[PDB]
Symmetry: C3
Subunit: 321 residues, 3 copies
């Protein structure tokens, strides 16, 4: 018989939590925690908004000293540098790429205003790593947190060296100069305020269109993890994000859990697909619902991801592989 892989029409993957640390104490504790939990979350060593101002050179060296060190056990430690209109952004790239025992897992670019700004920064990173004789290119992630970036967000998603786009909620709200209430930086405003909801969906649609990872902003709530876990669920199940920032180690497990695979999907996919197979991939009826190749795709996507990620697939599903 025919397999779904050969009859059905036609994805980006990074760890689901991006944990930010902007000071040495937090970096070291995060790194230690990553060793305990394993690489279920990335760590971003932050030079920008997560850090105080004034020690820019010293800070980039601190960051560089941790990359590929004894604390970086999995190679899942990236960085965020300064913005294009900042004096130290090239110095961040040079200091960090020169001194890091291993290159950062990715470089996060904040406050992109124009498409050319991002491309130029991506290009400088490539050039620098090329001359330092670094083996592979360094992935870049872009913040979409200005008017300019949101307007051209599809152009950003399309950029070659860019693996993900992240929403900058606070900067985006602040960018409206008070026209959007600060309640939009908290939940549920950050999901329900029409302009913020609109921006999040643009970023998400753009990422999916170009096979990039849509990364959700942090929850600034540092007490109620119940809120944080709910944010992560809405980002995932309503907004189509596949990753989310963390700003406190207690957020990490709530976020990772929210993005865990739903194993409940696997038996359903198996049943539907086996039946589809028997109907020669023509339309079928399942539980008062019509299915055809357009929905089969979904369930094959579900089975494919499950088997790939070494999740339990029913023996019945064998003739689909």
């Amino acid at each position: 018989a025919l397999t779904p892989a050969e009859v059905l029409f036609d994805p980006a993957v990074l760890p689901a939590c991006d944990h930010y640390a902007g000071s040495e104490k937090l970096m070291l504790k995060s790194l230690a925690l990553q060793q305990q939990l394993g690489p279920v979350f990335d760590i971003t060593l932050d030079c920008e908004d997560g850090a105080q101002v004034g020690r820019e050179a010293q800070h980039a060296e601190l960051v560089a000293s941790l990359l590929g060190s004894e604390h970086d056990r999995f190679g899942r430690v990236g960085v965020r540098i300064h913005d294009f209109d900042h004096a130290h952004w090239r110095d961040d790239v040079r200091l960090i790429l020169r001194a890091a025992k291993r290159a950062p897992a990715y470089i996060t670019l904040p406050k992109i205003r124009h498409v050319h700004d991002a491309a130029e920064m991506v290009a400088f990173i490539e050039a620098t790593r090329r001359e330092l004789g670094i083996a592979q290119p360094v992935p870049v992630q872009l913040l979409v947190e200005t008017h300019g970036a949101l307007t051209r967000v599809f152009d950003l998603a399309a950029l070659p060296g860019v693996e993900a786009l992240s929403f900058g909620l606070m900067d985006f709200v602040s960018a409206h100069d008070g026209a959007i209430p600060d309640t939009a930086m908290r939940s549920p405003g950050q999901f329900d305020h029409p302009l913020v909801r609109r921006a999040k969906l643009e970023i998400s649609a753009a990422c999916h269109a170009y096979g990039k990872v849509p990364s959700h902003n942090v929850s600034t709530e540092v007490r109620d993890m119940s809120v944080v876990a709910n944010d992560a669920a809405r980002a995932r199940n309503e907004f189509g994000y596949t990753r989310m920032w963390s700003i406190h180690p207690a957020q990490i497990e709530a976020i990772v859990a929210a993005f865990a695979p739903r194993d409940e999907e696997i038996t359903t996919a198996t049943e539907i697909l086996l039946a589809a197979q028997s109907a020669q991939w023509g339309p079928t009826r399942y539980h008062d619902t019509l299915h055809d190749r357009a929905s089969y795709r979904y369930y094959w996507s579900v089975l494919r991801r499950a088997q790939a990620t070494g999740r339990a697939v029913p023996q019945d599903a064998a003739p689909l592989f």
Copy 2:
């Protein structure tokens, strides 16, 4: 006095139901039903997802044999062919246009990824019908059900030989590789899931912008017609669709009814417009509400459609024509 037609600033129309049949038995039963009900719905003879795979040539000939036959009583029978990246799509066009006693009412193109893909297919259809000496061009309808089509959906709406765009809900959800839950293929998820709601509104706005018909996806619910009728109402009254696909003959009357004209609108339009006329088309007050030429347009659109479609217009409305 002055008529609305001469003072007011400044539409596409197809049957409101597009009934799909992908097998001979269903095609023949649909055709028979169309003869009974008259052409209140179109029929699309389906070569793609509504049909099993493997008999592609035989299937296109079956389809071609029904077009303009004794069963095709009104010329309101179209087809859906294979996609641009499929081997048999040109063969579908040639086999069907060559053998059909009368050309299809339209040709539906599934899974458009790029604007050039669609244009090229539209162009091949024109060329083929031109060489076969077919008298008029064959209208094309495009599925918007990929990332590429949604991104450039306004460019699609603008294409010259394209009369309508249809939303492919299942393919669109599947296109997100699991990021959108399968609950978004069912109601109310298919209206309330932010990314699906977003896609539907883009397609709709694009169609209206370029005078094309926005055609809504089928309800996959084949038991509860109450659900199907509600879907059709939301597609119409919230999303601005003017047509909807049917996948089961029991859906057809629910869909056709949902898109029926609201005669309640006609007396209101008459009253408002006659009063506007007397105020020399300056602003008026009607029921605690201010009206001016911007709203008069709406009510003239309502009267114009009613009189055109031979619906009952009050004798009082005479000085508006």
Copy 3:
């Protein structure tokens, strides 16, 4: 220590109410009311939909006679002229600019279909005022109330001589030829109908992206001011509009109040920023919530606007200036 102005990353302002009058009696009463209340609202002397048809030349002269007259006390009186596809639009510009003792505060262009249409009209206004030896250029405001304008609404926001975009709700609904129910011209439909909500957010995002004023459509409700006041609140707090049209003098105070500054914001901003300052503009904790430079921006925007507009700022905030 360091001030927010020197560490933080990175606005258009017009009166919050745009009161329309399309007849001499209403213009004169509006002008008198503006003298009483002071310039808390603009007045637009209307030649288009707010006026009856047929006296076009006489009407433009009436309008021109009031600009800069004894009734125009503050220079906050603009006009709306006819559309690009109208015969009298150039005549409106010439008659009005030639005869007005002082130039209009702005010129509102209705029913823009294409970007070039608007640019061309903006250019004619510049040319005319230049040859009449008028000292400064006349600001233009564009109506976004057609399909063509909404599609290219970001291109419109970007136009050099354009200070604001206004949503034309009734024309926009009417533009869909009945596909959008007339209930979308009333509240809550005008906020909740998905296509109208979508259009309003596009206009708003575009204006903010290019530093223009987003101006909300009028409430056509002329009895219940409670409705009007609620409309203004949703336009402001959900949709990000900073101005709203008025069509009845009783609407004016409800609209102006809805857009009044929230003084409650000032102490919060002060507290957060003073603390940020002490942490060397690194991240801080405030009330179970994490803050960093991305949110500080918001609160600095709040303080800056308060001090500028001569509102009461706490003595504690001194080291932030």
